[PDB]
Amino acid sequence: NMYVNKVWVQCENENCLKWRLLSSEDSAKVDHDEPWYCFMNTDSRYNNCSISEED
Amino acid sequence: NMYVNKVWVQCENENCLKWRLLSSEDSAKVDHDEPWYCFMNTDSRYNNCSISEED
Ligand code: NA
Ligand code: NA
Ligand SMILES: [Zn+2]
Ligand SMILES: [Zn+2]
């Protein structure tokens, strides 16, 4: 029995490229056929390309 | 671009059933066709059914 709780997703702004931590539910709600950017993050702590990557 | 860093795996000892956090590399090294138990955890902090689940 295994479970993925969280998934990292990369911002596709060529001047950012930061990895953001999403819940697995939120990652499931991303359209893979389109680019993903920081501003699409539901986590308001990490929803902007100017904010450093989460430790 | 997405990446799973960690995966939770459940102990199959009927008197334990605890979830343990594995790296995605370690989870990839588990044989799904066999039961998994706490003692199979490479993480010595959480490799025994008597140890509480990680926060
Ligand atoms: Na540039
Ligand atoms: Na019992
Ligand atoms: Zn960004
Ligand atoms: Zn156990």
Swiss-Prot record, chains A, B:
Effect seen on changing W8L: Loss of histone H3K4me3 binding
Organism: Homo sapiens
Role according to the record: Histone methylation reader which binds to non-methylated (H3K4me0), monomethylated (H3K4me1), dimethylated (H3K4me2) and trimethylated (H3K4me3) 'Lys-4' on histone H3. The order of binding preference is H3K4me3 > H3K4me2 > H3K4me1 > H3K4me0.
SS bond partners: none
CW-type zinc finger segments: 2-55
Taxonomy, superkingdom: Eukaryota
Annotated effect of mutating W8M: Loss of histone H3K4me3 binding
Outcome recorded upon mutating W8P: Loss of histone H3K4me3 binding
Record text about domains: The CW-TYPE zinc finger mediates its binding to trimethylated histone H3K4me3.
The protein's name in its UniProt record: Zinc finger CW-type PWWP domain protein 2
Binding site for Zn(2+): C11, C16, C38, C49
